[PDB]
């Protein structure tokens, strides 16, 4: 459901 | 298996594999090229990354979904087709933190490859606790949390706040904390903080940092937006 | 290596690989299914037909990309990663083409099976076209040309204009005639007269087969446009 | 380029 870290 | 093809081969193919968005071709070549046995460049630890955090992405979407539709159930073959998920997600989370452990880490001496790899270790801990029921759970966690706190040490002393990987890792260690954790005050709290640093020293860089900064900088706005 | 699973066991996971996306894992079960050697009902032929055309339909676009990145090049590098994805995506039509012989096609004596499954063998011989160049390529063009030309003898005796295997079987053919044997005008031609003999039986259908043909028909729409 | 069936 939260954003970690995508390019 | 990627035994007898050439380090620079496989990296190139890598690439390749990539613009076919066939990441577990690209996953099973940088595999071979960490086994080399020589240290990675920037590059190379990017390719690294993307590749397995695309193979386990469309494992933990799979999951997701197989675990919700044996939610709403309590055959067996439900449990059995989420199980099988599960072991092939928690073989190549192994996989990766293998790799950093033989011998990626213990190399990496430079403070932006040593906290790129123990932000991955944490990630994948991360990846190994979302799935984790048994006796084992207690540790899995600590096992995030140890590697994310190693990396945000030497991040915090070594790198600007506006660094790419210290922002990522924030991020990824906010989403620990407020996901895995149960602990949503630190995971805001890391967030709220690390964005305001990381504001305050935008005026220090060129166009293009800026743009790179910029983007992690909204990722930890649009979870703070989401938890407040 | 599905043989000991039940087959009401595979079918019912085949469902979840779809829900999950998990499409590789979909093939198999299926693939276990049709190995039962039963025949297979309308909506397992529908899981067989779905599980493997996204399989293939990946490999199809990966060669794609990499015979671009091939042909504007033109080390070995790109030629040998091309060449890994051909030979694994002739192994999955090769797997497919084995299930309709093995005996899929003569066990299926219905109008709806039987067309079925002669559609699906001219797709996957028109697969290993798009990537064949040596000795045996006007043989495998022959093969999709027949397996599709028994298909519209079937389909046009035994099927209403608006039947949806009937129109997806001659739009394929179609795209057959245009992309594979250099037949533009008897794609158009095809996909023209396909067309309108469905618009003048549409008033028989109700509202859902309505739905049901009028989707397929734009597709013929769709490539009348791109080719007139 | 032109398409085929697709669900
Ligand atoms: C976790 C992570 C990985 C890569 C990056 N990144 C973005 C742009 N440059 C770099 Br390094 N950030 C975070
Ligand atoms: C090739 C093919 C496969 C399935 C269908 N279809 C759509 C709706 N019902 C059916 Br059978 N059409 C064409
Ligand atoms: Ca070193
Ligand atoms: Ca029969």
Same mark, same amino acid.
């Given at each position: 459901?939260?954003?970690?870290?995508?390019? | 298996?990627?035994?007898?093809?050439?380090?620079?081969?496989?990296?190139?193919?890598?690439?390749?594999? &990539?613009?076919?968005?066939?990441? &577990?071709?690209?996953?099973?070549?940088?595999?071979?090229?960490?086994?080399?046995?020589?240290?990675?460049?920037?590059?190379?630890?990017?390719?690294? +990354?993307?590749?397995?955090?695309?193979?386990?992405?469309?494992?933990? %979407?799979?999951?997701?979904?197989?675990?919700?539709?044996?939610?709403?159930?309590?055959?067996?073959?439900?449990?059995?087709?989420?199980?099988?998920?599960?072991?092939?997600?928690?073989?190549?989370? @192994?996989?990766?933190?293998?790799?950093?452990?033989?011998?990626?880490?213990?190399?990496?001496? @430079?403070?932006?490859?040593?906290?790129?790899?123990?932000?991955?270790?944490?990630?994948?801990?991360?990846?190994? %606790? &979302?799935?984790?029921?048994?006796?084992?759970?207690?540790?899995?966690?600590?096992?995030?949390?140890?590697?994310?706190?190693?990396?945000?040490?030497? +991040?915090?002393?070594?790198?600007?706040? *506006?660094?790419?990987?210290?922002?990522?890792?924030?991020?990824?260690?906010?989403?620990?904390?407020? &996901?895995? %954790?149960?602990?949503?005050?630190?995971?805001?709290?890391?967030?709220? *903080?690390?964005? @305001?640093?990381?504001?305050?020293?935008?005026? *220090?860089? +060129?166009?293009?940092?800026?743009?790179?900064?910029?983007?992690?900088?909204?990722?930890?706005?649009?979870?703070?937006?989401?938890? *407040?």
């Amino acid at each position: 459901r939260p954003s970690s870290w995508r390019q | 298996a990627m035994g007898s093809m050439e380090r620079a081969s496989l990296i190139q193919k890598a690439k390749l594999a &990539e613009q076919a968005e066939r990441y &577990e071709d690209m996953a099973a070549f940088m595999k071979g090229a960490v086994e080399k046995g020589e240290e990675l460049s920037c590059e190379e630890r990017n390719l690294l +990354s993307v590749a397995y955090k695309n193979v386990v992405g469309g494992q933990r %979407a799979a999951w997701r979904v197989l675990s919700s539709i044996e939610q709403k159930s309590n055959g067996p073959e439900v449990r059995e087709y989420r199980e099988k998920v599960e072991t092939e997600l928690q073989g190549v989370c @192994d996989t990766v933190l293998g790799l950093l452990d033989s011998h990626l880490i213990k190399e990496a001496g @430079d403070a932006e490859s040593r906290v790129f790899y123990l932000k991955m270790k944490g990630d994948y801990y991360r990846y190994l %606790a &979302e799935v984790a029921t048994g006796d084992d759970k207690k540790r899995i966690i600590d096992s995030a949390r140890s590697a994310y706190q190693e990396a945000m040490d030497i +991040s915090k002393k070594e790198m600007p706040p *506006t660094n790419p990987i210290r922002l990522g890792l924030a991020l990824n260690f906010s989403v620990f904390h407020y &996901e895995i %954790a149960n602990s949503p005050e630190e995971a805001i709290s890391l967030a709220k *903080t690390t964005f @305001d640093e990381a504001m305050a020293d935008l005026h *220090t860089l +060129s166009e293009d940092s800026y743009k790179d900064s910029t983007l992690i900088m909204q990722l930890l706005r649009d979870n703070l937006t989401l938890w *407040t």
